[model samples]
Target: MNSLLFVYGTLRKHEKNHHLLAQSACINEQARTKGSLFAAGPTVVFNDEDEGYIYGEVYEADELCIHKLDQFFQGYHKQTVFVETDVGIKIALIYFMNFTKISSGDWKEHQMISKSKNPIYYFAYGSCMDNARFQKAGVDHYFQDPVGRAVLKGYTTRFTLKREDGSRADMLEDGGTTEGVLYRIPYSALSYLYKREGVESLTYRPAFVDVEAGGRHYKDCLTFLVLQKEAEIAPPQHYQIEIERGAELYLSPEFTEKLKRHMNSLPKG
Candidate 1:
């Protein structure tokens, strides 16, 4: 029999113990269960009085796979719970243990804090594609490794983050395609990127997007999107030049021409 399993910790993708689920089918990359995640055993607990959710991924597995997981997991109780996915709510089995609760409820994001110096895939869809600003800001060394020109589907680039001078670029989900360069940068670079994107001020927020490059699909590549969107406006001249320059260097000619036309047609305010 097939079973739905909600994995919030090490069993999730890219984690140390994820290989055990190699035979399982992943149904949701963004699934969440109602509960609190704790540090010890890195487990999640659903309480009758708790008022939060634990972020995780959901997998469809066979009875054999579930049995193997049950044997592998220790110090945890296997319990049935309802998880929320993009498609809808799903009833799945989860492993939980009582311990000190984690405030973020996201094990992946929580782990990222101390995982600096490790290489990470970064998708740059905005001025970040251009090295000029990075060089000017003295963070160019962190972005030296360019993976390839990557294509992100189901999204489009827009200048929606309005500023006093002009607008900045943002990725909008519009069932369109956005092209940019992918870089394998050190995790330490995220600190600079977070400040540059104005995350503290809520101008833009970090997001994971899927991208295809070199005939291979890359999942969970980090990128940034506007926290608040306004009317699309023309970017500053130099900023537009930077985008065009990066596009010319990395994107296809057809996409470059289309991007140029779109940028030229935007309202200048």
Candidate 2:
């Protein structure tokens, strides 16, 4: 009998667990499956998605590998086996909450496939880009690309490094619009991204946007965007910083200088 585990969260490559799985067994080439992933507090849950497909990889594991996986995924929920198709042959594991009291939102699958040779676009507007600040966020595992791009819209950006209580803060900013970045991450890290930025913060939210990067179209993956809210604090010079940093990495210097000048012309307090 063959044992297969369906992983939609960090267990995928380029995630924290990517090395773990790579060391355990020979993982097949990455693929996409249909499902939805949810953030139930600190942990992530995988459930049914009627119209969306979740991206993951299939691992050929022995009993030992399976045991290790079970231990790694422990806490916050139980794992169950279900047939994803009518073949009655292939089965996969899904993690979910028992109490049925968790919040349900849209968690779609965005998988990057290349026709020629290009990189996947991942838009980052938070601490995920700042090297020093990103290190303090606890989750250290990330893919670093020299060229990542983001476009600023009506949203603003700021550095919230210290709260009113003067504690080590999660460095975050707000933008009332969406941005783009070219990231080359394995399909598995989608869970971690969802856990960190997809939650409600009264001002920001994440949604998947179809973007053309490196001459490829990624479908159903997350691109960060700003949500509508009243009395939201707008970060000063956010557009300037986002474009400056983004152009420094992925865009042209001429475009960066132009955006900076454009931002300087905005009405300010």
Candidate 3:
């Protein structure tokens, strides 16, 4: 019997792992499983959900190809088994991590590029978009828009400061409302983004949102803003440092330099 496997994350086409499968057989774009994609340190993991389906490609593989994949993803503690597919019964490997250590939230089906009729759009509201800051963080392949915005509901934003004692202090009351930028990045860049922005900082998590930009509507995933519960602080300063970190990662060099000058002119706390 021919071996087949369901793929998500980096293994999808144009992604980091695309070349691995490309050498084996022709890959057919397919959807497998649904859930949230999280960057747990160095690895990406997904959880199963009834409402959404995670998008990936189906590959016709032999034993050798399966072995190579298994080795690469072994660190993530992924499980593999034979499952039903459009073509026939094949092996489907699902990636996951220790549920106890991380918060398991709602897993929605995000539109991967292979599954989307249009390109998957990403709204970057943090350091990952700024070019200089982003380069410092080791990220490439991102785009920015001048007039993109996303309304971060619920909790307010703030900034973190280092105290003289080497401990961290959050000056919440001194900050202003935090606003984010919308980025139209290719689905291929998700892994890079995850790495640049430590996935489990406990400050942010990925979430899907309906956003309108460039005269069109798109369903995209972004790092949801998180507020520190214990810290008593003011709203984020209009575009705080954290916001600049994201902007520097997603925006071009020219725009980032311009923003830097603008930020310097602002009053200091």
Candidate 4:
């Protein structure tokens, strides 16, 4: 029998300590738990009712592998928590050691001290694709360079983020492909985006997904997902026009037509 383990720190893929998981198989790359994350030990702590989210991956490991990892993480205490993944909830064991808490609740953000100094590959599937707002807002310089029309697998785009005017776009994990324009943006551009997406206000949070552009695969590309999703609603005509205009240059004709038809079929918001 194999035990399901949820790892939030060094044991995650591409981390220095991932080598210890050589014997385990990763079951889910996108997983999260509820807790507060600390910077000191990079630990996570939560009681049964904590509502905050912590990002991590889930793996299925053998008894010996778990035993070896338990030793490697000596100072940490193990607890079983319900992990939310793309598919369903998983009951898994986690090791947490607490210290100075981190606000993002993600180890990747903790590991990278200042990601703003570096350039980031940003995926824009909604109004962000339309540069009209950016130009008007005087942030067009950050999005001047367009990579290509990118394809993201196993997801779909829908207007699920409810707004007083209408609905904004949110990516749903529904086993379908979603296309968008990709941009290589500078760190300084993040401040503008952070406010636009209302990250601090809990409207949307940054999420990473792999995308393919020009038949080349890019990993860990940054995108935003709505923190709270509502029922699908049609975007206003003005908003839909932006998507159509932005996608005209990069997306395929068929997809653009499909997008238009899809929007036309929805009831006015």
Candidate 5:
């Protein structure tokens, strides 16, 4: 018989401890359970006993694989729970967090304090869409894999990500669709990217975005959008290059046309 594991943390693919599930196969890409996630320095724990919905993925492993997985979580206990997936509901095994709950649900989004070890989903609606900047930002190692293009439902892109004299892509609530790329980045790198983007010091801040990636809907994926007060304008040359390169590589032709039209409609400044 196949054993089922409902993972809301590291056991998920591309996460740090995912290697432990080498023998298992993913059954559901996006799954949810009743639990809360906590960021206790190095690890993220979930307790269905807590009152929140936990977003995660599901997998099927053999008996020995399940046993090894059980051995991996020492203090935690296991319980049978119902995991809701796109297809239907599944009765699976969940590991109860034995330690104190420090934060709340969603490992990737719980990095409110210290460095996070879990890989996070980053919606690149800006230039960093080009992973080439990962090394420059000193967080390239956090990059796991490209999930593919993502769409922001009610937001539109802007060239107002200005840092004093420079400019980049940001967002405006223009009731439009924004096309971008999604990458799985580790939590430890969040601080690095935060500093690089001027989170508290400059024109960008960390925030969650609702988006669709890999045919799965996610509500907690994070990104650093612009914090400018100015209206749409033409970005500096180098900045425009970054956006064009990213758009050309990941977004559709219509997006490029929309972008060009916006640029034409904006001031040269």
Candidate 6:
């Protein structure tokens, strides 16, 4: 009932252009293929069978949605490309281009790293794992790719820290693997995140951890650790929904079920 499509750029939820895929839903959060992503003018293009890897998200689209996307892309034509997903290599639809290629494969990520000439990463667990949640916090443009899940070893997510009547999630050391998204962010961007996370208020402090995202290893990635702990107050239902949505799309089933079980135990109202 659906066709699979691999999207590397704006069509992703992190960008404002996702309305084009009105009837589509993400099939895989971490997906890669033989193609490389490059900046083509103001937009990005995908080229097949390149030595570089393209990071993207796979979505399930209806026939009508596929047709709409084909028409929307205009010169970019769709082709079947084999992708490397967690399940194994699978075939998915890709929009290929014949435009000029940029040296840095991914543009958004490149834009962030260009200023510092050094790349810094941020690991988003809890609510920050969702791209939708990043927009209001003014951190949307900093991330380079779709959410790539990584296992944060020895950490358990708990609803700690009170934000008025609601609770927020923080990672506490544990004996389990927790999933988080590693975002390629610039060094200067840390100030923005610091204020938003309320560092002056001692709500969150920075911590470094090694994480693997986009099939690559990164060390000393930035993650916000709660500085204070509160009782078992439930996060707002709306807040829980965002965390649950991220968990469903960007984490392993085992981890997701564990998250849901805890959220379900919390009081609603």
lDDT of each: 0.82, 0.44, 0.46, 0.82, 0.69, 0.69
Q: Cα lDDT of model 1 overall?
A: 0.82
Report the lDDT tens digits of candidate 6 across residue range 6-66. 8777776455567988858777644666655666633444444456556566899899988
User: Which stretches in model 4 have alpha-carbon errors above 4 Å?
Assistant: 22-29, 47-51, 60-65, 111-117, 267-269
Q: What does the lDDT come to for candidate 2?
A: 0.44
| lDDT of candidate 1 over 1-269, digit per residue (tens) | 89999998999888888898877987776667778888885987666988767878889988888878888886667988888764578999988654567765778766766455367799998788889989988999988888879998767888999998789998776557889999999887888998998976768766677789999888778887775688899998998999999899888889889888988999996
lDDT of 2 at 146: 25
User: Residue 254 in model 3: shift from native, Å?
Assistant: 22
Name the runs in model 3 displaced over 4 angstroms: 1-104, 109-118, 144-155, 160-178, 200-203, 212-217, 232-269
- What lDDT is reached at residue 113 by model 1? 60
**RMSD of every prediction:** 4.9, 15.0, 15.6, 2.6, 10.9, 15.3
**How many residue pairs clash in model 5?**
2
Most TM-score-accurate candidate:
4
After aligning candidate 2 to the native by TM-score, how far in Å is the CA of 171 from where it should be?
19
Q: What is the lDDT of residue 194 in candidate 3?
A: 52
**Of the pair 1 and 6, which is ahead by TM-score?**
1
Error of 2 at 149 (Å): 4.4
Off by over 4 Å in 5: 1-117, 163-166
lDDT of 5 at 123: 85
Which model, 4 or 6, shows the larger TM-score? 4
Location of the lowest summed lDDT over 10 successive residues in candidate 5: 39-48
Model 4: per-residue Cα lDDT over 1-269, one tens digit each: 89899988888877789888886877876788888877675788786776688988889988888889889887777879899876678999998764577777777755542444368888999889999899999999999988989999877788888888888888887677889998988877877888899988989877777899988988777788887777788888799899989878788888888877877776666
Q: Provide TM-scores for the models.
A: 0.67, 0.39, 0.37, 0.87, 0.55, 0.53
Q: What's the distance in Å from true for residue 45, model 1?
A: 3.6
Model 3 TM-score on a 0 to 1 scale:
0.37
